[PDB]
Amino acid sequence: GDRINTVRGPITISEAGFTLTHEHICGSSAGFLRAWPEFFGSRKALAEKAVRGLRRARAAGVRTIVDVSTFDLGRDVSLLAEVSRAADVHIVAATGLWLDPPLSMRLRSVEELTQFFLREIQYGIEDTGIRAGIIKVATTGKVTPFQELVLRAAARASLATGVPVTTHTAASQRGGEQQAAIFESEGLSPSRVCIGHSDDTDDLSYLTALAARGYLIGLDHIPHSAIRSWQTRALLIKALIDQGYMKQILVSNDWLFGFSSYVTNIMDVMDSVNPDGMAFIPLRVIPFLREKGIPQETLAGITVTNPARFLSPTLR
Amino acid sequence: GDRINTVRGPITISEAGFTLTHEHICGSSAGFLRAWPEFFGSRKALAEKAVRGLRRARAAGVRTIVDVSTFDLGRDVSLLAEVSRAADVHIVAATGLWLDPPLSMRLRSVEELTQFFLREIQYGIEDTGIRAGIIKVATTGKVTPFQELVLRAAARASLATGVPVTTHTAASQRGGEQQAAIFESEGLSPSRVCIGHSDDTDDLSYLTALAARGYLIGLDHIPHSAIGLEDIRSWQTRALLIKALIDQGYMKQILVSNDWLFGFSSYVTNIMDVMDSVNPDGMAFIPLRVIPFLREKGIPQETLAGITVTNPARFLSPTL
Ligand SMILES: C[As](C)(=O)[O-]
Ligand SMILES: C[As](C)(=O)[O-]
Ligand SMILES: [Zn+2]
Ligand SMILES: [Zn+2]
Numbered sequence: 001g002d003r004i005n006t007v008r009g010p011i012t013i014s015e016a017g018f019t020l021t022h023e024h025i026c027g028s029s030a031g032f033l034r035a036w037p038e039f040f041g042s043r044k045a046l047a048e049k050a051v052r053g054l055r056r057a058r059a060a061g062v063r064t065i066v067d068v069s070t071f072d073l074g075r076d077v078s079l080l081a082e083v084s085r086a087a088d089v090h091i092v093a094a095t096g097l098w099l100d101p102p103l104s105m106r107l108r109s110v111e112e113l114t115q116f117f118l119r120e121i122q123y124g125i126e127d128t129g130i131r132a133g134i135i136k137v138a139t140t141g142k143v144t145p146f147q148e149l150v151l152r153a154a155a156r157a158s159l160a161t162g163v164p165v166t167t168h169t170a171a172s173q174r175g176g177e178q179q180a181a182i183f184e185s186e187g188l189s190p191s192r193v194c195i196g197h198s199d200d201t202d203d204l205s206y207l208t209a210l211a212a213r214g215y216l217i218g219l220d221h222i223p224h225s226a227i228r229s230w231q232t233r234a235l236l237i238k239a240l241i242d243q244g245y246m247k248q249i250l251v252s253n254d255w256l257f258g259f260s261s262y263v264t265n266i267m268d269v270m271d272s273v274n275p276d277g278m279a280f281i282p283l284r285v286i287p288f289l290r291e292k293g294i295p296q297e298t299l300a301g302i303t304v305t306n307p308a309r310f311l312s313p314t315l316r
Numbered sequence: 317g318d319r320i321n322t323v324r325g326p327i328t329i330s331e332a333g334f335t336l337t338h339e340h341i342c343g344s345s346a347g348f349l350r351a352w353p354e355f356f357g358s359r360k361a362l363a364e365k366a367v368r369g370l371r372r373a374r375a376a377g378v379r380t381i382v383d384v385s386t387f388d389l390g391r392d393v394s395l396l397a398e399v400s401r402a403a404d405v406h407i408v409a410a411t412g413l414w415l416d417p418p419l420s421m422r423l424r425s426v427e428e429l430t431q432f433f434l435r436e437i438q439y440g441i442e443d444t445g446i447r448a449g450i451i452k453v454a455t456t457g458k459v460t461p462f463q464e465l466v467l468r469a470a471a472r473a474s475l476a477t478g479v480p481v482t483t484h485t486a487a488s489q490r491g492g493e494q495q496a497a498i499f500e501s502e503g504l505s506p507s508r509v510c511i512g513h514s515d516d517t518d519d520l521s522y523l524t525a526l527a528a529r530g531y532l533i534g535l536d537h538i539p540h541s542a543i544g545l546e547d548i549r550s551w552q553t554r555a556l557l558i559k560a561l562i563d564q565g566y567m568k569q570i571l572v573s574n575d576w577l578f579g580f581s582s583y584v585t586n587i588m589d590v591m592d593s594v595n596p597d598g599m600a601f602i603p604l605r606v607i608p609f610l611r612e613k614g615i616p617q618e619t620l621a622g623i624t625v626t627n628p629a630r631f632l633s634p635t636l
């Protein structure tokens with residue numbers, strides 16, 4: 001109804017505050033952090049880096065983040081719980097599947113995938129009793145046969161629980177179009193769905209058409225500009241506000257503190273390019289929008305009200 | 317030299333006894349057993365099935381099994397430890413990488429992979445303190461660039477620690493030949509390598525040439541015969557490869573196993589029920605069916621003991 005499951009337990013809508021809806025503590029692979037923690041220096045070093053990063057975002061106003069790391073991104077909810085407590089920042093955990101499913105997942109039916117997503121929402125993740133509050137899915141432009149099963153399983157899990165769905169897309173391939181078609185074929189309401197990485201395109205008519213159908217538009221790669229400037233990506237926010245779709249916007253950094261599912265030392269490159277980390281949205285994008293004339297009430301609606309409406313489990 | 321790592325700690329080689337060198341408690345994926353235990357009914361149901369099966373294997377004479385499940389086969393060494401203690405059967409754990417490495421492994425250099433394998437051999441697996449006693453690798457006929465990195469990392473770890481390497485191959489592709497060439501380019505002795513799934517072929521020329529070089533030949537798919545779609549040979553025809561290799565003078569290069577398991581999520585659903593209804597003996601298939609079949613064919617008892625006890629001991633002893 002109006003309670004959201006976090007890694008520390010359920011919270012009410014009003015407790016969520018300023019929420020970043022697409023983030024990671026650690027981008028990895030299933031089993032990897034526990035099998036090879038020295039890849040990150042140590043588990044303690046990674047935890048301490050994440051706590052400093054969250055404590056800084058908190059000092060910039062952030063009160064909640066949604067960690068959209070799935071099973072196959074190496075989600076370690078025990079890590080999330082530890083860092084959430086030390087930082088005093090709410091963390092919402094995810095179920096779903098990203099782009100690296102192991103064989104034991106790739107060979108499952110849509111019915112089996114539905115049961116796994118439902119277990120993580122309704123019973124808990126692993127043996128921790130921590131329940132997921134969002135379902136994360138991913139496709140690569142043209143949806144593969146397995147990715148279609150994942151999206152349908154995600155829709156069915158969302159329909160049984162009211163928990164929202166958030167996606168990874170290739171925006172340059174207009175990948176949200178095929179995602180939306182599958183979701184609607186399942187009877188999922190677009191207001192339960194965020195089409196993510198949408199700021200990777202300049203095609204405003206693609207974004208507006210999705211927003212016009214009721215989808216949330218995830219503009220979460222603003223600090224990933226590395227030819228368009230981050231200011232140019234951020235102007236997509238103002239463009240959608242001006243078209244009257246302020247209610248459909250979600251904003252985030254898609255940041256992380258460890259990253260093993262990429263080449264070695266990528267985290268050092270990323271941190272040198274965006275030293276603000278997860279504080280980039282509150283420290284840079286929000287003042288940029290206020291200076292371009294966006295009023296405080298609109299910015300509060302995007303960063304507080306929109307994520308509350310999105311994360312609150314709803315079947316209406 | 318004479319001590320090997322098991323999931324219960326170090327043992328002397330003389331305590332290994334009758335050893336099955338290619339087995340699995342559970343064939344899965346990294347993280348999967350802990351995230352979705354109800355795929356196997358429950359973690360408790362799976363442990364109890366493994367304990368029952370290992371107990372029947374022990375009654376048939378088995379004293380040690382080598383679980384060649386890697387990280388990416390979802391190896392859960394805490395489960396291996398629990399079932400080894402409850403069945404009172406030695407289990408040797410594995411490091412290495414099989415055919416399903418996640419991105420965090422696929423993107424690593426040969427140097428990084430070497431450190432990972434050395435971590436699991438010299439320090440321990442995850443935070444358990446349990447150390448691997450063997451390195452498992454896998455290729456699919458034509459070795460991929462990343463698979464070549466894994467084989468070179470495995471050879472370097474083996475040279476640093478002395479623990480052996482065992483492989484997954486497509487014997488129909490004669491895959492052991494490309495593996496051996498990579499291993500020998502790293503200076504690894506063939507006596508430290510088992511070429512596995514070798515009973516998937518009839519090509520005695522291919523098998524004897526590897527054995528003549530000092531490689532161990534893993535004949536580990538005998539009870540997989542009656543599983544159709546792949547192969548039409550009976551398990552008796554597969555077992556006669558053991559007799560064939562003995563007759564050519566290569567008894568010291570033979571390792572025999574079941575490649576069985578008690579849970580199997582890295583395959584289509586309900587495969588475990590098909591496998592168990594076809595081979596109800598499970599891991600006891602080798603001691604209960606194959607060994608008497610071979611003794612009937614005139615193979616001396618002391619040759620069979622050499623194959624099931626002596627060859628595994630020489631292979632697993634850290635040597636170098
Ligand atoms: C884990 As990602 C770089 O696809 O948001
Ligand atoms: C896990 As297997 C079927 O390659 O021995
Ligand atoms: Zn993504
Ligand atoms: Zn992400």
Ligand SMILES: [Zn+2]
Nearest residue numbers: 483484485513
């Ligand atoms: Zn194999």
Ligand SMILES: [Zn+2]
Nearest residue numbers: 339340384575
């Ligand atoms: Zn195997």
